[PDB]
């Protein structure tokens, strides 16, 4: 009654230009991985879910103008 609450970050992927992003839900960590390439670069940027959220139920896109949005359903 009547809410659906998500979580939801943002990442401005533009500058790094990755050739490849890897998005990897585990032990309710979630790792964003880019790579770009001598010389290779390479980031990588962990968010902690809150509590109870489904590991095979985070997605994610990229925005034609760089911007990488990550969210997941909230459990309630």
Same mark, same amino acid.
């Given at each position: ?23 990897? &839900?585990?032990?309710?960590? $979630?790792?964003?991985t880019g790579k770009?390439?001598?010389? #290779?670069?390479?980031? *990588?940027?962990?968010? &902690?879910?809150?509590?109870? $959220? ?8 990229? #925005?034609?103008?760089? *911007? ?9």
């Open positions: 009654s009547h809410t659906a609450d998500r979580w939801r970050v943002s990442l401005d992927v533009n500058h790094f230009a990755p050739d490849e992003l890897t998005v990897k &839900t585990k032990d309710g960590v $979630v790792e964003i770009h390439a001598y010389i #290779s670069r390479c980031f *990588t940027r962990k968010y &902690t879910l809150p509590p109870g $959220v489904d590991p095979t139920q985070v997605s994610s896109s990229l #925005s034609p103008e760089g *911007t990488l949005t990550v969210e997941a359903p909230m459990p309630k």
